[PDB]
Design an enzyme around this catalytic site. Structure first.
Site, PDB file in Angstrom:
ATOM      1  N   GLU A   9      22.988  12.358 -49.861  1.00 62.40           N
ATOM      2  CA  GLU A   9      23.654  12.759 -48.627  1.00 62.40           C
ATOM      3  C   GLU A   9      24.182  14.187 -48.695  1.00 62.40           C
ATOM      4  OE1 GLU A   9      26.455   9.363 -47.392  1.00 62.40           O
ATOM      5  OE2 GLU A   9      25.020   8.492 -48.809  1.00 62.40           O
ATOM      6  N   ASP A  96      24.462   6.885 -51.054  1.00 70.32           N
ATOM      7  CA  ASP A  96      25.550   6.170 -51.703  1.00 70.32           C
ATOM      8  C   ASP A  96      25.469   4.671 -51.413  1.00 70.32           C
ATOM      9  OD1 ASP A  96      27.636   8.936 -50.720  1.00 70.32           O
ATOM     10  OD2 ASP A  96      26.453   8.686 -52.551  1.00 70.32           O
ATOM     11  N   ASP A  98      27.373   2.369 -50.343  1.00 77.63           N
ATOM     12  CA  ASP A  98      28.149   1.672 -49.330  1.00 77.63           C
ATOM     13  C   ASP A  98      27.256   1.221 -48.175  1.00 77.63           C
ATOM     14  OD1 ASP A  98      27.624   4.157 -48.288  1.00 77.63           O
ATOM     15  OD2 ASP A  98      29.709   4.820 -48.259  1.00 77.63           O
ATOM     16  N   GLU A 100      27.191   2.215 -44.932  1.00 69.72           N
ATOM     17  CA  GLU A 100      26.582   3.333 -44.220  1.00 69.72           C
ATOM     18  C   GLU A 100      25.506   4.011 -45.057  1.00 69.72           C
ATOM     19  OE1 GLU A 100      27.743   4.459 -40.929  1.00 69.72           O
ATOM     20  OE2 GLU A 100      28.737   2.502 -40.970  1.00 69.72           O
ATOM     21  N   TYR A 324      34.543  14.869 -54.779  1.00 67.37           N
ATOM     22  CA  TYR A 324      34.361  14.490 -53.380  1.00 67.37           C
ATOM     23  C   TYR A 324      35.673  14.043 -52.744  1.00 67.37           C
ATOM     24  CZ  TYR A 324      31.462  13.285 -49.432  1.00 67.37           C
ATOM     25  OH  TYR A 324      30.848  13.328 -48.210  1.00 67.37           O
ATOM     26  N   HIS A 370      32.626   5.942 -54.477  1.00 68.73           N
ATOM     27  CA  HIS A 370      33.220   7.149 -55.034  1.00 68.73           C
ATOM     28  C   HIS A 370      34.482   6.888 -55.820  1.00 68.73           C
ATOM     29  CE1 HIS A 370      31.076   9.011 -51.435  1.00 68.73           C
ATOM     30  NE2 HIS A 370      30.472   9.539 -52.479  1.00 68.73           N
TER      31      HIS A 370
END
Length: 685
Positions: A9, A96, A98, A100, A324, A370
């Site tokens: 991303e 990632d 997750d 989304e 991040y 994260h």
DNA sequence: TTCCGCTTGA
């Protein structure tokens, strides 16, 4: 041939991973989502324009099928991604882990349409062991997860785009409603109404400057009156919000004439200590910064709004200074833990570091996308080098960096273990037994407080975390001479308004919003005219009152504080494979047995709700904010009309009655500051 | 007109 395409991303992580994988891989970034539902009718493809559900962008009449289009900003991104797809042999979808992120991976699948092998993986740490284990152990795309994400996106579209037109018809056009912003607005509005219905109550007692001669002569401290003849003197906690004494006939509220009378009632009394205990406390260090706590502490300690905190954080991350900054985890890696350990031992010695490995893990699911915001790297860049590297029109970068550094190292330090005194004196004044009380306390070892101290809220106030109030010791029965007695009158205070910090902490506590959109909610509610900022306080507008009222009175469940939490409960079931993607979507939109009794499914479905409420909502009633009655008993309203807000009241006129008396209000008068006196001044001229 | 969410340069 032999080359691999890896898509993540963020360009920063793309560059890091490219550096640590080298030739034979070309790592590129999608910059988050590349497709979405059409924002407006213009974004609908032509041969879908006259489709009855096109205004929604969701085929709700056929298993809730979304119309996905490519975001115009990411069009070039997809152009290059498609082109680059042609000279590789495999594609690593490495967004990632997750919900989304899985959805993004699936969107990349649908948009690139690769004929080559695809592998789904998630890179945690940027090291050769972790990346090797992530590449050599691929997994399948989680269609349950993608389905849950689709359900979330679809619900938020149906909510926003079905409820907002109601606001256009009943309140005013261009106004908005949504699962997150409407509940934030309702939080601010509700606190303001609490401020409007608040009635302050007055209560006195006596403050005393005292010395210590006859006790143990080893010198001026304070004390306060506490009880009279076995009856506690009232304090602010003893009154409700209406000024009534709270459900307790065992408390006496003193006034001036009495407090002065006891103040002069006995100045020559030797105060005699009655009871005393000792209370040591052991407070653990603060977890490392996540997005919410970093925004709050950057707001209270450095006066940065959420948006500015995120801008500076973005520059610091993109330039390699910090981890991040959009995260919801407080866990650290062993590298970061040991780094903060060595820095703490360095600047604060080996006696101020944590003996046990202080790990601050949360409780949600293990799949942590994260970790906490920390100084990046194996070694932490010293804040002095950061100080000289960052200079010009933006020293704030260094300031927030100093914040993140000091918090992170503070996270791996030993606890603070001070001690507080509970001093209870007794005596008699007049002929009544009076009880005095006092509390001071000192920190034996500041511990992590030596590095980081949390800042108390501006409007909420309170004692600082490292505050210390010293005083001599005392023994039961010791004598104390009264240096000076002075009466003190106090009043109860209305509850404080929300700052950006306290609003964010609120939303997080309710489990609504996310680390990426916290500042966006604040911007949004200000942009729609629901919330304006007075100083650091968030003040709701009158049309925020009208909207909020419509929502809680006709779409109640949709603005329940736990709506989002129940939704998340459903989507977890979708992601676990226990429920189908359109099962609860069909129940929610059209109706049925499902969930809590107050659920929209039970109430007949959101569609039926908007259908019957678009016809039977009194626009006058929605746009008439009930304030108070005057001294003649005539109601006074804030009416939000096309020309702005005006104060209205029904009057007896010439040929009798009724006749409206109006006086429109400048937006400079907050809702709670408008009293009846203010209202009749405005009505006057 | 209008949503939430992921992510950067338009």
């Amino acid at each position: 041939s032999g080359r691999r395409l890896v898509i993540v991303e963020s360009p920063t992580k793309a560059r890091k991973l490219a550096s640590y994988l080298g030739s034979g891989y070309i790592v590129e970034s999608s910059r988050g989502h590349i497709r979405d539902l059409p924002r407006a009718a213009s974004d609908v493809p032509a041969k879908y324009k006259s489709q009855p559900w096109a205004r929604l962008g969701v085929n709700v009449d056929a298993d809730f099928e979304p119309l996905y289009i490519i975001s115009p900003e990411k069009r070039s991104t997809v152009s290059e991604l498609r082109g680059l797809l042609k000279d590789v042999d495999e594609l690593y979808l490495a967004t990632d882990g997750d919900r989304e992120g899985e959805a993004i991976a699936w969107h990349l699948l649908e948009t690139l349409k690769p004929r080559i092998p695809v592998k789904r993986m998630v890179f945690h740490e940027i090291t050769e062991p972790a990346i090797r284990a992530a590449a050599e152990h691929p997994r399948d795309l989680d269609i349950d997860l993608v389905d849950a994400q689709e359900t979330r996106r679809i619900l938020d579209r149906l909510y926003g785009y079905e409820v907002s037109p109601v606001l256009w018809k009943k309140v005013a056009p261009k106004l908005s409603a949504g699962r997150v912003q409407s509940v934030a607005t309702r939080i601010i509005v509700a606190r303001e109404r609490d401020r409007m219905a608040f009635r302050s109550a007055a209560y006195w007692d006596i403050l005393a400057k005292l010395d210590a001669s006859v006790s143990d002569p080893d010198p001026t401290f304070s004390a306060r009156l506490t009880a009279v003849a076995g009856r506690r003197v009232a304090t602010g906690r003893d009154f409700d919000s209406l000024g009534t004494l709270r459900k307790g006939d065992e408390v006496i509220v003193l006034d001036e004439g009495s407090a002065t009378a006891l103040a002069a009632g006995l100045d020559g009394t030797q105060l005699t200590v009655a009871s005393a205990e000792e209370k040591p406390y052991a407070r653990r260090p603060y977890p490392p910064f996540m997005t919410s706590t970093l925004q709050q502490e950057a707001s209270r300690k450095l006066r940065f709004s959420a948006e500015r905190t995120m801008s500076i954080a973005q520059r610091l991350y993109e330039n390699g200074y910090i981890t991040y900054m959009r995260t919801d985890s407080t866990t650290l890696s062993e590298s970061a833990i040991n780094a903060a350990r060595t820095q703490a031992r360095q600047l604060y010695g080996d006696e101020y570091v944590a003996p046990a490995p202080r790990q601050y893990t949360r409780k949600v699911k293990a799949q942590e996308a994260h970790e906490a915001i920390r100084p990046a790297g194996e070694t932490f860049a010293t804040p002095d080098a950061v100080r000289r590297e960052l200079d010009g029109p933006n020293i704030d970068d260094f300031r927030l960096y100093e914040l993140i550094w000091q918090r992170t190292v503070a996270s791996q330090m030993a606890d603070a273990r001070g001690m507080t005194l509970s001093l209870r004196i007794t005596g008699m004044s007049g002929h009544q037994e009076v009880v005095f009380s006092a509390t001071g306390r000192t920190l034996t070892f500041p511990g992590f407080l030596k590095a980081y101290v949390e800042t108390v809220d501006e409007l909420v106030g309170g004692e600082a975390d490292d505050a210390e109030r010293r005083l001599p010791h005392l023994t039961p029965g010791q004598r104390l001479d009264i240096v000076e007695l002075t009466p003190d009158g106090h009043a109860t205070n209305p509850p404080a308004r929300y700052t950006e910090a306290s609003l964010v902490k609120a939303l997080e506590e309710l489990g609504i919003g996310r680390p990426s959109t916290y500042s966006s909610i604040i911007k949004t509610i200000q942009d729609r005219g629901y919330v304006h900022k007075k100083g650091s306080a968030l003040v709701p507008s009158w049309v925020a009152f009208a909207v909020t009222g419509l929502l809680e009175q006709h779409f109640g469940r949709l603005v329940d504080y736990d709506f989002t939490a129940a939704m998340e409960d459903e989507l977890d079931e979708i992601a676990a494979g226990n429920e189908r993607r359109t099962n609860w979507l069909n129940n929610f939109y059209f109706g049925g047995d499902h969930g809590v009794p107050d659920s929209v499914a039970r109430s007949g479905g959101l569609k039926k709700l908007v259908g019957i409420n678009l016809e039977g909502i009194d626009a006058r009633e929605v746009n008439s904010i009930k304030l108070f009655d005057d001294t003649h008993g005539r109601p006074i309203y804030v009416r939000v009309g096309k020309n702005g807000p005006y104060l209205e009241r029904l009057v007896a006129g010439d040929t009798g009655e009724p006749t409206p008396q109006r006086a429109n209000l400048s937006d400079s008068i907050t809702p709670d500051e408008l009293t009846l006196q203010v209202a009749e001044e405005l009505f006057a001229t």
